[PDB]
Amino acid sequence: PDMDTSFVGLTGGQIFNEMMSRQNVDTVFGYPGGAILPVYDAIHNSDKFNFVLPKHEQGAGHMAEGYARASGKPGVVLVTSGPGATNVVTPMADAFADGIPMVVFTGQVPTSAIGTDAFQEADVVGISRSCTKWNVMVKSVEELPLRINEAFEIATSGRPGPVLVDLPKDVTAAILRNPIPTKTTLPSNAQDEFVMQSINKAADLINLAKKPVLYVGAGILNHADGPRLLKELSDRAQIPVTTTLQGLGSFDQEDPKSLDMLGMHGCATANLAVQNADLIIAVGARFDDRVTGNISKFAPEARRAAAEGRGGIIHFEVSPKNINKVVQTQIAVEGDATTNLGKMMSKIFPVKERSEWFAQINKWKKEYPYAYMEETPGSKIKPQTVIKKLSKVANDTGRHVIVTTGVGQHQMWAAQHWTWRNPHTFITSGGLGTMGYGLPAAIGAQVAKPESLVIDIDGDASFNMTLTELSSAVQAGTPVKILILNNEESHTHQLNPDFIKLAEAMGLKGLRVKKQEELDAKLKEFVSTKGPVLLEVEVDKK
Amino acid sequence: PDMDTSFVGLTGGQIFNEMMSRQNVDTVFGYPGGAILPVYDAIHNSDKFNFVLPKHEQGAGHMAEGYARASGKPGVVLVTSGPGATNVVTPMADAFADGIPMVVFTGQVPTSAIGTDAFQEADVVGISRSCTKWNVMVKSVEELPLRINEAFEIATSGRPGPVLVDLPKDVTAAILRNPIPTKTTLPSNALNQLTSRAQDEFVMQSINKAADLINLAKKPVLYVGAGILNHADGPRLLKELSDRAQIPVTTTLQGLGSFDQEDPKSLDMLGMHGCATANLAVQNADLIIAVGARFDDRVTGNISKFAPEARRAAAEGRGGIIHFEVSPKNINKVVQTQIAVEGDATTNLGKMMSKIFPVKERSEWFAQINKWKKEYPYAYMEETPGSKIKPQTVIKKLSKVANDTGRHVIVTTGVGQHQMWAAQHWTWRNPHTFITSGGLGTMGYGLPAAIGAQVAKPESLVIDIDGDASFNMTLTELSSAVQAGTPVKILILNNEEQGMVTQWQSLFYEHRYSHTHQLNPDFIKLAEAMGLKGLRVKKQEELDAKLKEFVSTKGPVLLEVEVD
Ligand SMILES: Cc1cc2nc3c(=O)[nH]c(=O)nc-3n(C[C@H](O)[C@H](O)[C@H](O)COP(=O)(O)OP(=O)(O)OC[C@H]3O[C@@H](n4cnc5c(N)ncnc54)[C@H](O)[C@@H]3O)c2cc1C
Ligand SMILES: Cc1cc2nc3c(=O)[nH]c(=O)nc-3n(C[C@H](O)[C@H](O)[C@H](O)COP(=O)(O)OP(=O)(O)OC[C@H]3O[C@@H](n4cnc5c(N)ncnc54)[C@H](O)[C@@H]3O)c2cc1C
Ligand SMILES: Cc1ncc(C[n+]2csc(CCOP(=O)(O)OP(=O)(O)O)c2C)c(N)n1
C-alpha cells in the first residue's frame, strides 16, 4: 500500500547509483559498451564509486572475486551486452563453485529488440542459468530497485554466490514516471526450536568428548565474527583445529592448537587427529573427497563413538541440501555457523586441559612434518623453498598480508608451505580451478585492502592466461607483488615471454632469480618495492 | 558391411584421432587439462595433425574461427572441463552470430560424476545451448564416432555454425569392446545426393521466376552477403551474373571480398558506415537481388524507407526483392520479400544462369551510378603539414603497400572505429580475405583470428588491423604467434588519448567529447618481450618507410601507429 516518490524523475542510471549506495557498494569492476552505457555513465561520473577498469571482462570478474574474498563484501561487476557478458561466464562459474558473493550487471539490447537476433542480443539469462544462484532480466525501470535488492540478498545469503541481472538499455535510460512501492526500494530484509534443540545437543556432545577435533572450511569466513568465535570455542573447550584449503587463515597456524590443513595434501598430524577423534565438529565445510579420502574409511574413531552413543560428527551447515549428503551426522546444526556458534558458546563447558590428546598431537607433529627434496649445492631452486622463505619475509614486514594464486602445483605448495595467520588472506580458485585467477584476484584484493601487502603466488602457464591485466594494476594504483614460479624448461612445451621485459613494458618493476644465492636478497627487494613488481624465480621441474 | 569392427580394441582417444582423419581435419586448436587428457594425448602426439596451442582457451576459439573463415573448413577446438569450457563461450557465441563452422570438443568429468558437483563439472551443454546450432554429451565410447559425424555435418550445413560435443573422461579413456553400426562411423554427405521430382520442381519454379523477373532488368542491384562466400564457386558465379546481365554489386561488411571493388560495376559496401553510392543505388532500389545476406539493421535502417523504388516495382508488380536464402526461418523475417529462392545461393545461381538474358549495357543507370560516386566520395579530414596521422590514411597506404607485394592478403580486425575504417578504406578484391567479428563484435578477435587464418593459408600475407583497446583483450597470444611461427603482421592504430566512451558531441559531428581512458603497455617493448619485432610511427614523415618495413619483415611483427 505504501508508495515511494523519491526516485520519480530520475533515470535508471541514477536509480542504480542510489541502490548501490544503499547496498554499501563503493567499488565496481567492469568495462563499458553501448548497451550498459546508461548505467556505466552514472557510475563513472559519480565520485562515490571507484570504478576499476581491466583490459578484459574476465579480469573484472576475477577482480570482483578477489575483492569479495578479501573484504567480506559482494563483488559488483558491470559489463556490456553480447561478448561483454559472455566474457564473464568463467568468473561467474568460478564464484558459483567457490560460494563467492558477486552481483553481475549485464547491458542488454532494448526490450523491444529481444528475440530479433539483434546485434549482441545474447540469451545471457539462459547462458548463466547454471552458473548463478539466480538471474533475471529487468523489464521496466519501476522494477529496477526490486531486482537489485533481490540480487544482493540472494548473492549474500545462504551459501553466497553469483547472481546476474540483465539490463535492457531502454530500461536503464528511462526516467521513472510513477511512484513505486516503498518495500521494493529497501535492502532486504518449529524449525527454530529444532535448531535450538540441535544447538543444545551439539553442546552436550562437545562437553562429553575426550578427543574432539574442529574441522573448519570456507563457511566460517562468511560472517565477520566467525574466526573470533572459532577461536573462542577452541580456547574454551581446548579443541584442536584443522582447516580445509578454503578455510586456511580462519585459524592462526602459530596457535599451539592448530593442526593446519586436513586432506590428501594436508598435514599428517591433521589427518591422524581426525582419524582418532571421538568427535568431529564440522564448521562450514563440505566433506570433499580430497579431504576425507574413501568416505567409508573416514573418521573411524568418531564412527565408533557414534555407535557407542558418545561421539560422532556434528555439522554446522547453512544449506539443508548439504546435510547428510556425504557423511551421516549425529547432529546437524542448520543455518549460519557463526551465528549458531555464538548461540552455543554459553552452553560449552570450559575445559582446562586435554593433556594426553595434545601430547599425542604434538608427538605426531614431530614424527611427521611436510617433507620434500630440498636444495643441494648447485641444484635448481625448489618452489617449496621459495614459498617458505617468502612466507617468512612477508610476515617479518609487520604488514597485513594477503595471498592469491594461480592453478597448478604451485597452488598446493602455497596452501601447504605458507604459514597462515589471518582470515580472508588466502584467495585461490579451488572449486573451478581457473588458471589466470591469481593476478586479477590480487588486483581486486588490493582494491579491497589498499594497506595490505598483496602477493600472487603464480605459475608460468597460469600467469600467461591473464597477464594483460598487469597494466590494469598500474592504472588502478594497486602495488601487487606478482611471483612467477617458472618451472618450464615430445611433451607439452609452451613458449613463455621474457617476464621481466614484459613487466617493464606494462609499467612495473621486474626482477629475476636464477640461482640459490640470489634468492634471499631478491625476495627482500620484491616485498620492499613500493609499487607493483614482478619477481620471476626459475625453479626445478616436477 | 552392417557392423564396423575397425575401432574395436581402440581407446576413445584413438577413435577420436581416426575420426578427425575421416573428417579431413589436419589442424586442431586447443589447450590441455585432466579431463580431456585421453583425447589430447592421442592427437597432440600425432604426425597427422597440426596442434596449435594458445595461452588462453578463448584464443583457441578465435584462432579456429579465423582458420575456418580463411579456409572454408570447420575450425576444430579441444579444451578441458570446467574453466576450459567456459573460456570458449565467447568464441562460440561469436561463431554462432557470424555463421562460422566450428566444432568444439570439451573434456568433462566422468559420466558417474555428473550431478555430484564434482571438481570442474560445468553444465556445458546447458551453458552453450543458445550459442551452438546443436550440442550433445557423449555417454559411451560406442556413441563417439556417431556424435563426431553429426557434429561436423551440422556445423557445415544449412547456415554454418558452432556445435559442441561434451566428452566425459571415462568415455574417452574407455576401450571399444563391441562392433558398432557402420551407418554411425561413416561421415555423411553435403550434396553428393539424390532429390525427388518434387524437390527439383519446387526449387526450379522459384528459380524460373526471378530469372524472368530479372531478365526484365531496369535498375537492378545485387545486394550480396556472407552467404555467397559459403560455396567455393559463389564469387565466380556472382561475377558471371554481374557480367551477363551487367549488374552492379554492393556487399555487406561480411560480403566484402566477394566482388572485386576495382570492377566498374562495384558499388562497394552499404549501410550505416557504407558509401553513399551503394545506399543510393539501393534505397531508390527497384529490384534488389539479395544473395546470402540478412538485412541487418545497420544495413537497412530505415525499414519503410528502405528500397522504396523497389517497394514500388513490387506494387506495380514490376520489381521488389528477390532473396537467395539458405534458412527458410530467415525468409521474410526482417523484410517482406516478393520471391524467395531457398537453398544454397551459389547452387541456385548456377541453375538460374542460362535462363538469364545477356545485356548490352545500362548506362542510363551506369553513368548515373558513375555520378553518385564523384558527387559523394568517402571523405575525411586529410593530414596537413605537422598534423596528426589519420587512421584512414594509414589504412589506404597499407592497402597499397600490401598490394605491391603481389601476394594473397588476408585482413583481420578488432572491434571499434578502426574496424569500420578497415572495411571502408581498404580496397577489397578476393574472397575470404576480410575476417572480422561482425555479428557479435568481439574485441580481441584480431590477433588470434589472424594466427588461425595464417595457419589455414601459410602462403598468405596476414594483417591484423587492430585497435589499442581491442588488442589489449587478447594480447597474450603474441607469444602463441611466435611459438606457432605464424608471421602475422599486427597493426595497432593507437588513438588512446580519446576516451572509449562518448559523453556528447557537436551536432554537425565535428567534435566528440569522450572519457574512460585505458593505460596501454609500451607496445614495442611488449612485442620484443613476446619474441617478435616491434615498430612504431609517431610522425607523418616516418609512415611510408615503416609500413613498407612492416609488410617486408620476415616473421611476426607489430607496428604501432600513433593516430589523431
Ligand atoms: C587434486 C586436488 C587435491 C586437493 N587436496 C585438498 C586437501 O588436501 N585439503 C583440502 O582442504 N582441500 C583439497 N582440495 C580442495 C578440495 O577439493 C575442496 O575444494 C576444498 O576442501 C573445499 O573446501 P571447503 O569445504 O572449505 O569449502 P566449500 O566447498 O565452499 O564448502 C563450504 C561448506 O560450507 C557451507 N557454508 C557456506 N557458508 C556457510 C555459513 N555461513 N554457515 C554454515 N555453512 C556454510 C557450504 O554450504 C559448504 O557446504 C583438493 C582439490 C583437488 C582438485
Ligand atoms: C560497429 C559495427 C558496425 C556495423 N555496421 C555495419 C554496416 O555499416 N554495414 C554492414 O553491412 N554491416 C555492419 N555491421 C555488421 C552487421 O552487424 C552484420 O554483421 C552484417 O551486416 C551481416 O552481413 P551478412 O548479412 O552478409 O552476414 P550474415 O550475418 O552472416 O548473414 C548471412 C545470411 O546469408 C544466409 N546464408 C548463409 N549461407 C548461405 C548460403 N550458402 N546460401 C544462401 N544463403 C546463405 C544466412 O542464413 C544469413 O541469412 C556492423 C558491425 C559492427 C560491430
Ligand atoms: C583455464 C584452464 N585451462 C586448463 C586447466 C588444466 N590445468 C590445470 S593445472 C595446468 C598447468 C598449470 O601450469 P602452471 O600455471 O605453470 O602451474 P604449475 O603446475 O607449473 O605450478 C593445467 C593446464 C585449468 N585448470 N584451467
Ligand SMILES: Cc1ncc(C[n+]2csc(CCOP(=O)(O)OP(=O)(O)O)c2C)c(N)n1
Ligand atoms: C569484449 C567487448 N567489450 C566491450 C565492447 C564494447 N566496445 C565496442 S568498441 C569499444 C572500444 C574499442 O576500442 P579500440 O579497440 O581501441 O577501437 P577504436 O574505436 O579506438 O578504433 C568497446 C569498449 C565490445 N564490443 N566487446
Ligand SMILES: [K+]
Ligand atoms: K602451513
Ligand SMILES: [K+]
Ligand atoms: K573500399
Ligand SMILES: [Mg+2]
Ligand atoms: Mg608451471
Ligand SMILES: [Mg+2]
Ligand atoms: Mg582505440
